[PDB]
Amino acid sequence: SVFLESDLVTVGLAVDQIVGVDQRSENFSVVGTLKLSWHDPKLGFSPDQCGCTVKSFEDASIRAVAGEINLPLPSFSFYNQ
């Protein structure tokens, strides 16, 4: 392709339980799970420099990991949080 292309992201969400509704302040609370997936060759690495097949980051948001590795990542937010 002559032009650059946007990266494709797969998203999925599930709802486990509605734990409350506030009828005076007009808000509700929910419990669920979120999942994201995408492909980026700039994140690729060689196994022989770490002796592993999986590189993992834990207990960090997407913004923090993007700032640490200095690469753009698809950060997200809840609109009405």
Add this chain to the structure above:
Amino acid sequence: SVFLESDLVTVGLAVDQIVGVDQRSENFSVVGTLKLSWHDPKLGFSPDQCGCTVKSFEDASIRAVAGEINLPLPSFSFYNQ
């Protein structure tokens, strides 16, 4: 053994008091004690460099200590916390 073997962990839990049940939001609270024990020779040390028999870490989670000493430790979490 030719193959590597997983490290064995002994666990125990005791419940002291049930302090509340929420019948609308479907949750409860409890007070108790948790104990873990495991054996790992990689954590051993020589007394002659410290002159002591017990080395201790206080007021820190297992993840923090593992990140400080750069060794794998059996971290845990409560599933429905």
